[PDB]
mmCIF file of C-alpha atoms in Angstrom:
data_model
loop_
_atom_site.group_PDB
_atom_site.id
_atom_site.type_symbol
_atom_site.label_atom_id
_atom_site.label_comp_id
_atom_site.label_asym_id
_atom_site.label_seq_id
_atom_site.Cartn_x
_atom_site.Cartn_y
_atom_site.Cartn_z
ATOM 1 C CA UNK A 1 -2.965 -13.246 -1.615
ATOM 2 C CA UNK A 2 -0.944 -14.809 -4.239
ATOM 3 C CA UNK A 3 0.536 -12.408 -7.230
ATOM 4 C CA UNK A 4 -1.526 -10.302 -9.488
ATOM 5 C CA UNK A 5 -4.197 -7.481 -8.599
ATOM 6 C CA UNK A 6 -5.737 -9.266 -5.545
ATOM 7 C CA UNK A 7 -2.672 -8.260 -3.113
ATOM 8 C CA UNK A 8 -2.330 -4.850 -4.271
ATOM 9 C CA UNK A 9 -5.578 -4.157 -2.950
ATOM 10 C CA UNK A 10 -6.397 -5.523 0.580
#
């Protein structure tokens, strides 16, 4: 989890 599309998903 950081910033971008990574932590949008799960």
């Amino acid at each position: 989890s950081n910033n971008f599309g990574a932590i949008l998903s799960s």
